[PDB]
Design a protein around this ligand. Structure first.
Ligand SMILES: COc1cc(OC)c(S(=O)(=O)NCc2ccccc2N2CCCCC2)cc1NC(C)=O
Ligand SMILES: COc1cc(OC)c(S(=O)(=O)NCc2ccccc2N2CCCCC2)cc1NC(C)=O
Ligand SMILES: COc1cc(OC)c(S(=O)(=O)NCc2ccccc2N2CCCCC2)cc1NC(C)=O
Lengths: 456, 456, 456
């Protein structure tokens, strides 16, 4: 049996934030959730998360996923772990201890760590890593058969010890029964106390302590400030986009393309640099996303072309073309082959197959049929100061350019609205509606106006 | 005499694509065309390209540039090269063999390779490179005078051989006559066969095999998946933008600026990060391109300022200002000093010198004279559902804000269209035209409406 | 006493520019000003800047900050420094000599350089650096006690000397009196002359020459072309954004976010990749800036959300929301909680608290009260060809969608403008104003029009 203890009690002072430190997001989810995902690879029988600062915010994030225990104040990692003792005491197994602020550690690394532990029948295994600049980190002191003798902190380090390159990442696997027996010893013997103290207890008793070394040092990143949060973001970005490229997705610049951890992207999608895909977004096969495009919680079908446009909480069917500079706002649905062109906003509207709105148009709170045409400058009007009205537009409606459609009004199938019209009442199917002043010319009169070349 | 054989027969399974692998684009052209360009530096007397998977797509790309031969199925590099034998057999010279999927190899490297070959009178020269992580690559085994003894693949490598850092890039120069004599030997002696086999034949006969080492390992990149395609993109980007900067072009961020291989840019142009220039685009002296700007197949004159705007298949004269957020669509011409401001679209239109359209305007299928003014919100209307009409606007026309101009109509020189007008017929030069309803106020009435503060 | 001599006389031929080389900008200010800022850390009693090519442009940049002297033609660094002799001759102290083209050198490095100098009572201290690729640079030759013996240029270097990794950065501290005594010796003994010559004079006299080595080689960057200018930009960017992140600002991608040297950003601001902040801009606490956002010389309050929008020379109060794709042009003020949505332009206008303009709207030269509403498509009209008029809009005005407001006109408190209206005269408080043609339907008529499905 494996168990996991996740440390998530800390504030994070250097973040300059009132968030619990582990709740800051990387690629769309908290550091804590990244750590939780990796922990899952060990198939823990029990997962206990230690909360402290703003416990309720963390308890919302992992609600129903973990047991919680609380440490009332900061008395160190040893005390943190002690809060889990009423749950874990006396159980037979292997217990991972990991902090919520190391979001790059992978489930493959945790499983290799656990296997290493079990395979070498260690009583404790330290997950270590190796760096050319170890200043600041506890050094790993091994004897000649490569067992850990101790963990020496920077301050207490002899000059020879400072040359040591192998560092303690602060993540461990312990024999669960021995872990709580040793911590009680430390506890009863005294005001902070440290999970590293247990290593020294096992060194007193000659029990076997080992170290399993991460192949990639960046995985050991402990995030304590926004500098480190942006590093984690960069490593995570490269990780996500590499998965995509292996899966058949093209990136002009995968180091400068911003896709959240749970976004899904079908093979043969082509993504230019500086595209942003956020939350529960899905992109269908062969779709093209050009530079500047920003999609959040939306589904986009196959063979679409999203040109520098922002789409939010909406569905976009196959073959749709949107942009450049269009805005599809929440609860919109764009049916197959629809075209939405520049400076067009769609809000709260269903738009039927093959309909086109190429320019300078606002479609708000409309139900729109198939093969509809909106001339440039068409404005739908839904809000009077209190009421929000709906407009119904049938199939094959032709809405003339620069018309103003005042809801609630129905345009029946095949009707036409004259360019420049203000529409205040229903238009029956097959009818036209014209609501505009007629043009009167006056010859010669421009001559007295300021734009005239002679007055220039 | 030099000859070249380019391998372009392969599918590319890991690409997850139905394209021939060499047709995927880097900086605007296929990998294959990049390789073709580099090959040209050797001044080959004959260039033969070996096609296989979707031969017709490759044959379109290099139409009239190369001879083609076809390999009907994948029986290895040796068989690929054998398809060129009816063309190259018995000719005296030096024959480069290079794959269409190594798009970073430069013509300078190929010429140094050929010269090395000729100068050392090798019978075969392997283009090699050196890496600290050689796992996977054929290792180059040299004797003490530094001649190649053999090429050892990963699988057949002894442990001492795996330490070898010098790898086979899969690009070679062969004595042409000896090349086909040796391949026939291999062929008649048997079902894949390999161009590396020829090296072993020359080792049997004691003929001189050499190795010329690339100074830059990244040049040896063989692109087999979209991860590697994005690496090639990144190396190519840096290569292109460095040429630009040496030529006098400023880059806020040349690692994050996306300019195609054949774009031309005059000295003193200033380019912000995240600008995209594609296809046959030219940018004249001192022009400024701000972040987000996207130009495809367009010419832009000197002293222009293109602010976060997209321009396609169009010409932009000197001193023009476009943007932010404007869209110049195909077949537009913007005359000297024109101004196109925010949320303005120009399509299929010629716009004369000094004309201005600063806001929320669509100019579609218009011929526009000089010193014209378009008020904010002006909509031209060209499409009725079937016909596409033209509008003619003379010099010094003043088009009032939020007017709707319904083609085909002519506005004569110096005429004015009243703000808010729907224009359905011609306006003579020096005339005004007003087509709008007159304002009627009703005092006190807002009091019963939902926006009123008291109802709030 | 410390003195500083800044070299700013050179053209910069490889820049392909007519600017003085030191005036090219990095992160918003010239290289020269960066060097001036770092120089200030030594608290110089006198700062003298040597000008030459287009002296007047440099003299504007540092007007009132430095003494100037002119070198009439390029006769080398020794002559450059000699121009400062009528000012500095005979004064007791330590004199930094630094070029205006090394903009990454920090004031902390200059102070460590000066302290090193004073502490080791050197007569000259060379600021050196160490690189694995020293080709091109003067090498530092030290004897066994580590004193500098000489500076050997590439050309005159023996093969053993070319292996030397420690290079001369071209920045120095000299004993001021000895500096001018030695230069006169060199001068009277002859047509270029070099500040390095003074090192050889001190080697003749056995006076103490030392070297202080920069910890970071990138600081030694001398910018001679636009390639190097973009490197300086990249190092500076990372430097600025790291200061921000330490201060509590989140960056999705601080390697691809473009913030000028004097921009101020409060803690807890969140900045997506590809945001541009320029000049005297300030961003208040917790404000969010999304990808594409571009702010120049503007103040933005606390808790605002600026979504992909461009803001120039304007003030934005707390809690304002702007964008996506909006443009706040010079001299605008957006009061607390205002909302400006997509394709909206604000120019030269004051907009009162809680007012909303969500779409396709141009507000130009208006004074706008609080809790005003602008329907989509509203156009204000201020320019007739000569005059620029103002419009006054009172509190709680409701401007109907696609209205055209022709200045000078006043809309009184709580008034309403009917959707689609052209407004040519004042509207009293509590009144409505309607100026549009009434809708007339004709049944059946669409049947003869081109959009009808049957004609399709
Ligand atoms: C050129 O495109 C248009 C022409 C139009 O009138 C000639 C009108 S219209 O709306 O004024 N009238 C519809 C129409 C279509 C075709 C032919 C004639 C007409 N109208 C003539 C005048 C009375 C209504 C029919 C609209 C468009 N197109 C757009 C995109 O709005
Ligand atoms: C303030 O800018 C305008 C004023 C206008 O009327 C006072 C009109 S107008 O189009 O209604 N009339 C033209 C005009 C210009 C100057 C002075 C008077 C007028 N009109 C007065 C009423 C009849 C037509 C002349 C247009 C503009 N400007 C824009 C950008 O449209
Ligand atoms: C649905 O939103 C609107 C309805 C309107 O008329 C029914 C008008 S209106 O401007 O035509 N008339 C104002 C109005 C508001 C509420 C109820 C009725 C009315 N009008 C009815 C007809 C005469 C004027 C009052 C404007 C809006 N909204 C926008 C954003 O413009």
């Amino acid at each position: 049996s494996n168990f996991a203890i996740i440390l998530a009690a800390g504030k994070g002072t250097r973040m300059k934030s009132d968030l619990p430190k582990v709740l800051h997001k990387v690629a769309g989810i908290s550091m804590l959730e990244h750590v939780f995902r990796s922990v899952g690879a060990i198939q823990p029988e029990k997962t206990v998360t230690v909360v402290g600062h703003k416990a309720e915010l963390v308890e919302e994030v992992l609600a129903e996923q973990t047991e919680f225990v609380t440490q009332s104040e900061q008395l160190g990692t040893g005390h943190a772990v002690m809060m889990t003792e009423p749950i874990l005491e006396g159980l037979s197994g292997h217990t991972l201890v990991i902090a919520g602020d190391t979001p790059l550690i992978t489930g493959e690394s945790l499983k290799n760590l656990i296997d290493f532990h079990i395979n070498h029948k260690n009583v404790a295994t330290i997950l270590t890593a190796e760096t050319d600049n170890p200043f600041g980190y506890g050094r790993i002191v091994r004897n000649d058969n490569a067992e850990v003798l101790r963990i020496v902190e920077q301050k207490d380090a002899t000059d020879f010890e400072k040359q040591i390159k192998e560092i303690n990442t602060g993540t461990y696997v312990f024999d669960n029964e021995r872990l709580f027996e040793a911590l009680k010893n430390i506890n009863t013997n005294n005001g902070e106390y440290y999970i590293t103290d247990v290593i020294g207890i096992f060194r007193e008793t000659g029990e076997k302590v080992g170290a399993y070394t991460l192949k990639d040092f960046d995985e050991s990143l402990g995030v304590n400030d926004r500098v480190a949060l942006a590093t984690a973001e960069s490593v995570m970005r490269r990780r996500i986009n590499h998965k995509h490229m292996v899966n058949g997705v093209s990136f002009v610049n995968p180091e400068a393309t911003y896709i959240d951890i749970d976004v899904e992207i079908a093979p043969e999608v082509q993504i230019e640099a500086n595209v942003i895909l956020k939350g529960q977004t899905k992109i269908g096969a062969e779709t093209v996303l050009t530079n500047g495009t920003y999609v959040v919680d939306s589904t986009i079908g196959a063979g679409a072309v999203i040109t520098n446009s922002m789409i939010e909480e909406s569905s976009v069917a196959d073959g749709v073309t949107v942009g450049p500079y269009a805005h599809i706002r929440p609860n919109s649905s764009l049916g197959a082959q629809v075209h939405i062109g520049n400076f067009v906003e769609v809000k709260g509207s269903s738009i039927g197959e093959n309909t086109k709105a190429g320019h300078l148009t606002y479609i708000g709170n409309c139900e729109v049929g198939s093969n509809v045409n909106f001339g440039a400058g068409t404005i739908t009007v839904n809000y009077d100061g209190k009421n929000k009205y709906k407009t119904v537009i049938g199939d094959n409606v032709f809405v003339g350019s620069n018309s103003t459609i005042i809801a609630p009004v129905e345009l029946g199938d095949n009707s036409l609205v004259g360019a420049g019209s203000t529409i205040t009442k229903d238009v029956p199917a097959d009818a036209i509606a014209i609501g505009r002043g007629r043009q009167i010319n006056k010859d010669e009169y421009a001559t007295r106006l300021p734009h005239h070349p002679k007055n220039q």
